[PDB]
Amino acid sequence: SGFRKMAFPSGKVEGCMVQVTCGTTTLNGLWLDDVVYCPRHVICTSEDMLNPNYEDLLIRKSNHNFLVQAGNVQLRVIGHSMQNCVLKLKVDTANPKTPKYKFVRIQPGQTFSVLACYNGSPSGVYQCAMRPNFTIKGSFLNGSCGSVGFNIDYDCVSFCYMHHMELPTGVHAGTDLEGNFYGPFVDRQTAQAAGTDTTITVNVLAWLYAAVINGDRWFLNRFTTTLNDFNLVAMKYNYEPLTQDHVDILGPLSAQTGIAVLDMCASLKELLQNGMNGRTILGSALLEDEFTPFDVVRQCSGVT
Amino acid sequence: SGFRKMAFPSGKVEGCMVQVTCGTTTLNGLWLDDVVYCPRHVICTSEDMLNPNYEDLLIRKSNHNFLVQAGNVQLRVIGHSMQNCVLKLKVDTANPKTPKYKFVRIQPGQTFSVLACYNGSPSGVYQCAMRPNFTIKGSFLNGSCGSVGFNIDYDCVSFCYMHHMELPTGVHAGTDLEGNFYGPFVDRQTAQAAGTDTTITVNVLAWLYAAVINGDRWFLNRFTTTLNDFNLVAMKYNYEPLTQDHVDILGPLSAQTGIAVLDMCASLKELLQNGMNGRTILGSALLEDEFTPFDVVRQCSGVT
Numbered sequence: 001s002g003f004r005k006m007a008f009p010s011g012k013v014e015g016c017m018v019q020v021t022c023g024t025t026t027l028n029g030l031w032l033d034d035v036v037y038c039p040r041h042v043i044c045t046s047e048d049m050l051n052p053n054y055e056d057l058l059i060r061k062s063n064h065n066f067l068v069q070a071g072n073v074q075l076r077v078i079g080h081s082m083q084n085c086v087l088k089l090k091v092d093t094a095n096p097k098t099p100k101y102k103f104v105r106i107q108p109g110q111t112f113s114v115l116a117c118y119n120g121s122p123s124g125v126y127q128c129a130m131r132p133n134f135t136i137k138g139s140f141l142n143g144s145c146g147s148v149g150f151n152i153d154y155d156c157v158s159f160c161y162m163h164h165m166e167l168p169t170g171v172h173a174g175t176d177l178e179g180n181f182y183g184p185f186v187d188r189q190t191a192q193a194a195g196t197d198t199t200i201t202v203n204v205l206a207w208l209y210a211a212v213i214n215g216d217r218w219f220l221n222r223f224t225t226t227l228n229d230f231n232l233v234a235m236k237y238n239y240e241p242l243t244q245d246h247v248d249i250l251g252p253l254s255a256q257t258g259i260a261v262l263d264m265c266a267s268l269k270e271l272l273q274n275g276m277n278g279r280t281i282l283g284s285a286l287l288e289d290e291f292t293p294f295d296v297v298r299q300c301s302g303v304t
Numbered sequence: 305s306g307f308r309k310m311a312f313p314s315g316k317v318e319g320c321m322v323q324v325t326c327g328t329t330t331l332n333g334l335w336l337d338d339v340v341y342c343p344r345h346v347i348c349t350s351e352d353m354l355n356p357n358y359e360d361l362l363i364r365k366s367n368h369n370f371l372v373q374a375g376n377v378q379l380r381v382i383g384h385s386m387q388n389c390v391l392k393l394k395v396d397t398a399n400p401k402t403p404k405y406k407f408v409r410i411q412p413g414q415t416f417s418v419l420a421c422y423n424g425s426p427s428g429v430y431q432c433a434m435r436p437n438f439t440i441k442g443s444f445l446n447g448s449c450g451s452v453g454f455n456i457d458y459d460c461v462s463f464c465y466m467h468h469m470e471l472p473t474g475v476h477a478g479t480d481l482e483g484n485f486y487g488p489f490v491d492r493q494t495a496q497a498a499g500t501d502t503t504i505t506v507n508v509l510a511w512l513y514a515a516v517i518n519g520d521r522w523f524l525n526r527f528t529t530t531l532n533d534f535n536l537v538a539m540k541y542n543y544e545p546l547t548q549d550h551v552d553i554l555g556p557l558s559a560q561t562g563i564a565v566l567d568m569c570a571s572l573k574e575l576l577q578n579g580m581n582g583r584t585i586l587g588s589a590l591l592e593d594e595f596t597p598f599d600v601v602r603q604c605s606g607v608t
């Protein structure tokens with residue numbers, strides 16, 4: 001028993017982290033096979049980060065201007081190309097530590113682990129969710145760019161995120177591994193609206209089921225609701241509308257606990273309307289939305 | 305910016321995890337150099353877990369009864385011994401992946417990362433604190449025994465914890481790497497009192513400083529207090545008494561923010577007496593105590 005904000009074991013990703021330097025800018029890259037992936041803003045100075053013309057900036061760069069270091073050893077760059085907002089530096093050596101991997105573009109509301117890195121060196125690992133508004137609430141300082149987000153299924157690492165920037169609001173934005181930003185964000189130092197964020201309803205319900213499994217049951221009530229009635233409450237509290245697809249994904253947890261999904265929605269409705277009254281659920285005084293139904297089942301079944 | 309419950313990168317520890325089987329019991333072991341460390345209750349059946357005589361049980365076991373597997377390869381056990389509540393299985397092969405390591409006995413209130421494992425395979429990593437009452441609030445299912453807690457300083461892993469049991473209350477108990485339990489716990493399936501837990505005051509203050517650094521400042525007030533006045537409030541709210549040693553450890557954060565430690569105590573005093581009034585600090589609706597002052601400085605300075 002017990003429920004924690006658990007990250008995937010990071011070893012397979014630690015073996016891919018490298019340092020990429022271009023001019024006076026240093027950030028992290030991801031070395032998979034014979035390619036190193038990093039944010040294209042590695043080619044920017046502070047005088048052009050306000051409005052960079054990446055095509056023009058990259059033209060002034062040659063393979064020898066990209067310094068790639070894996071621990072203490074230097075990699076030889078034999079090709080460079082820009083794909084969307086990422087640079088792909090072809091190197092003459094395949095990473096011997098390359099795990100089985102995929103590049104995936106996650107959906108908003110899905111979770112992943114972030115391995116924060118500085119100068120190609122791992123500093124820490126944490127779990128987070130891609131917000132409905134396509135930002136992440138991470139922990140990133142200057143130099144963390146190029147740190148990646150990922151999920152692991154047995155021996156396969158699915159890379160879903162590469163860190164590119166911190167918005168003036170302090171939230172984080174980045175791309176998939178093809179260099180496509182999540183959300184409307186551009187890699188420019190300009191004011192950028194993230195838009196209204198909402199609470200990931202299906203994840204809050206999944207966490208409520210995790211709470212019941214682990215003994216926190218005070219919030220269970222004698223009520224039920226309908227999807228339409230529940231969604232009227234969800235709209236008022238800036239929660240994502242719950243769909244039958246969400247109810248279907250909650251199926252295993254509903255079956256395990258014997259608590260019908262609409263009954264759990266009624267518990268959530270009462271928690272939204274009444275608050276916690278100074279009580280806690282799984283050590284939290286707020287409704288947690290960073291665990292998907294898959295995460296709750298994985299953590300509750302001990303999947304390795 | 306941003307503040308997260310960050311765990312250390314787990315790769316160095318993942319390379320040490322092995323599966324240990326004895327009879328019909330399977331749990332995790334830690335392979336460092338030519339020794340595998342695991343909880344001694346690996347030799348117990350369910351008929352004797354109620355009151356085991358470990359000395360008598362171990363006498364009926366030989367080197368060949370301890371099956372140790374590192375991934376797909378079997379290790380040859382050439383010696384076995386019991387040290388307190390851990391077994392040390394000498395193997396004929398030194399772990400090629402053994403990092404630089406130390407065994408340390410952490411103090412209550414200190415933090416560490418746990419790499420939860422099942423059948424010698426890593427499932428997840430999370431950060432936690434050793435409670436003042438020497439329990440940990442982890443996430444452990446059957447088979448997780450032998451999973452370890454650790455801290456990392458550059459290239460050195462300091463192992464501080466090995467998981468042994470879940471108390472009937474759902475909290476977790478274990479040992480240092482010499483097999484000495486933290487707290488009064490015994491490795492028996494009996495009722496065991498954990499004792500009164502308290503909030504780690506120095507960690508809450510460290511987290512309040514982390515909040516100020518990251519912009520959450522609403523809780524700062526026009527008041528100050530004394531150590532004696534603050535400790536009267538701490539006693540009433542089951543917080544650990546703050547000492548000058550704690551004030552001294554908060555020095556760097558007090559210097560960085562320009563907020564005197566006793567002024568931050570006055571903010572904490574008002575938060576204890578008035579509550580959060582429906583507000584949050586670093587995304588939390590309660591006062592967080594699982595970040596030490598060292599952790600706040602590390603996370604805020606990007607130490608790798």
Ligand SMILES: COc1ccc2nnn(CC(=O)N(Cc3ccccn3)c3ccc(C4CCNCC4)cc3)c2c1
Nearest residue numbers: 041044045046049140141142164165166187188189305
């Ligand atoms: C300063 O504190 C942080 C904290 C967390 C951070 N996460 N990401 N970033 C980076 C970031 O947002 N930008 C803005 C931006 C502008 C243009 C393109 C893309 N992004 C950025 C990018 C590059 C540079 C380099 C210029 C040349 N000299 C070396 C730094 C400086 C800032 C962080 C910065």
Ligand SMILES: COc1ccc2nnn(CC(=O)N(Cc3ccccn3)c3ccc(C4CCNCC4)cc3)c2c1
Nearest residue numbers: 001345348349350353444445446468469470491492493
């Ligand atoms: C069942 O769910 C959990 C969940 C989280 C858990 N963390 N730890 N433990 C293990 C645990 O507390 N005990 C109690 C105990 C008794 C004696 C000595 C030490 N500890 C335990 C130990 C060994 C065995 C084995 C007997 C032979 N068959 C294979 C299991 C069974 C339970 C967990 C169990």
